[model samples]
Target chain A: TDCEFGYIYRLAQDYLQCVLQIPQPGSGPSKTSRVLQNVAFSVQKEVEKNLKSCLDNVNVVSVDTARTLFNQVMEKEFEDGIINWGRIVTIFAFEGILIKKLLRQQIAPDVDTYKEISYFVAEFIMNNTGEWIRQNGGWENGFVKKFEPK
Target chain B: AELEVECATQLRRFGDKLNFRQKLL
Candidate 1:
């Protein structure tokens, strides 16, 4: 729970900006690729330490089924009882990693499937978090100020 | 469907290590 929200925030932004093509201010490979690389180590370290089982009975036979998983992801952010950027971005990081996580019955996705998984994740995130983010600068003014890595 | 804890082995982190699914196994 003590993981630095800043690093998690950056991880989420990189994936959205680079992989998902969700436009954000001052984004892309020259800026974000290195940032993604640097921040990934921290994100992995935190996730590895605090890893715990939270979803079960969820099947991922195909990428289209990924939507059901977002229901679980939403509650994690909601649990903290705050609707701020830090928790918001952490949920994105969580969603991003989940798309690639390996499990008992199912393995993670290939590149094409990975794209499909990310589509669901981004869709869910926008549906739920979009309004709040728009009010909070929608990745241009406020988000970059609050969460962008230096 | 009813939420089942029997297989409630979900991990908050990535599904890689020591996540709930791994714990049950």
Candidate 2:
């Protein structure tokens, strides 16, 4: 339950901005990305400690799914929630890396590199969570009924 | 009568798949 705080709270707020395409007021990356990164990291770490408590626990799947939701690409996966972490890292990894290359090319000197961060996160949620929601029918809202094995 | 009889054949095929059949009128 504690692990869901970021999603239940921060995600609802941050995700809205991403879908709306509302640029942050500042000239740099939006402060929201930092919060998301922190939440991703928190979930990743929490999953690791919890997964170790039980062998082959099903909750590990959710952890793994969340890890892949946002993160950078890594040769070695994290202990339990590696996939979700990779996705979260990848979400902003391109910002400091690829966008820097484009900036050096003079394509965008004042570019807010985190512009696509939300798209990446949102897509990650829809892809990973959408599948999970399909397999399991217990989301808070009644949207779960729409997919009742029909 | 010929077309009515012909269309009834399609309904039987559908019923076979669904495991339910209708009596011809």
Candidate 3:
């Protein structure tokens, strides 16, 4: 049924995207970014259960590692910084590129939307998580303040 | 009436938040 297939695809997409989108200050990728890639791995594993599955070729990372890394990275954020909306969209976009590439669906990089996403989340991080950064670091420099928020 | 209106507005915001939160999963 289309509904069932659609629902699973959506579930996969949603879960994968959420894991990708959280903001962090790491060199390789954000914690959420790695988790989403892991989800792509998990989803690939699940789809491969039925041998002749169309999505078989795609590979995802390990959920256990995702959980471990997620927790380690999460210790650094306030409330895990897992808000809805904007963040998930950004995460989804991150893996969407990778998945498309994996599936050989790549054509042209959708840099425009990707730019908008990065800009949106970056500004959001600047505005909402400014204090976090202030405590952790500042701008590119990453500094902490002695005084609390007034 | 005022209290009723406030409750309704609160519920509306709650609903929006609920939707957004669930959407992430």
Candidate 4:
């Protein structure tokens, strides 16, 4: 049971956190920061609505379903090979926090190993996704870029 | 400003935990 629960938590955490740390649009504080809070709120609500049932039924949730759930949290559209990275990043951050909250409630507080695994998984996912985002246009690429005087 | 601080603090908490775990690793 611990094995099942641990892997499910780990995979979901990895995916969620990896998405969060992706560079968002805007800079110099206020604009991007507020987006983070707002986006996180949106993502969190989506996760609760979509995955709360699965998370509550730990015994029934599987790795495949967990991954599917992760994918669901990250659902969005990319138009003309472009996207609002700020919006996506905000959603990612929200999903990350929400998933971690679920894990904290499900896993024993004293389980230090779980924490380590979560951290590494998050780091690994972040590294890979961050690079991908940078290659595209950097995570912070948003309307700010469009509005800037060129 | 207050909201920004609150959000950053929330993320900082998560970041701190990750850093601590990385140190252990």
Interface RMSDs of all predictions? Answer: 9.9, 26.7, 19.1, 12.8
Question: Candidate 2 recovers what fraction of true contacts?
Answer: 0.00
DockQ of each: 0.06, 0.01, 0.02, 0.02
- Which scores higher on TM-score, 2 or 4? 4
Please identify model 1 stretches exceeding 4 Å from their true place: A1-44, A53-65, A79-81, A102-110, B1-25
Docking class of 4: incorrect
The collision pairs in model 4 are A24-A140, A25-A140
lDDT of each: 0.45, 0.33, 0.34, 0.39
At residue A54, give the lDDT of candidate 2.
34
The full ranking of all candidates by TM-score, starting with the best, is: 1, 4, 2, 3
RMSD (CA, Å), candidate 4 to true, equals: 15.5
User: What's the iRMSD of model 4?
Assistant: 12.8
At residue A86, candidate 1 shows an lDDT of: 44
In model 4, the Cα lDDT at residue A70 comes to 36
Write one digit per residue (lDDT tens) for candidate 4, span A25-89: 33333333344444445545554454454444442123333333333333322212333343344
- Residue range A13-81, candidate 1, lDDT tens digits: 456444333454663443333433343434444653444333344555545455555565565535443
CA displacement after TM-score superposition, residue B4 of candidate 2 (Å): 63
Scored against the true structure, residue B12 in model 1 reaches a CA lDDT of: 29
Error of 4 at A87 (Å): 9.5
Residue A68 displacement (Å), model 4: 14
TM-score of chain A of each: 0.58, 0.29, 0.26, 0.41
Clashes of 1: 7
DockQ of 2: 0.01
Residue pairs whose backbone atoms clash in candidate 3: A19-A32, A21-A91, A40-A60, A41-A60, A41-A61, A137-A142, A137-A143, A138-A142, A138-A143
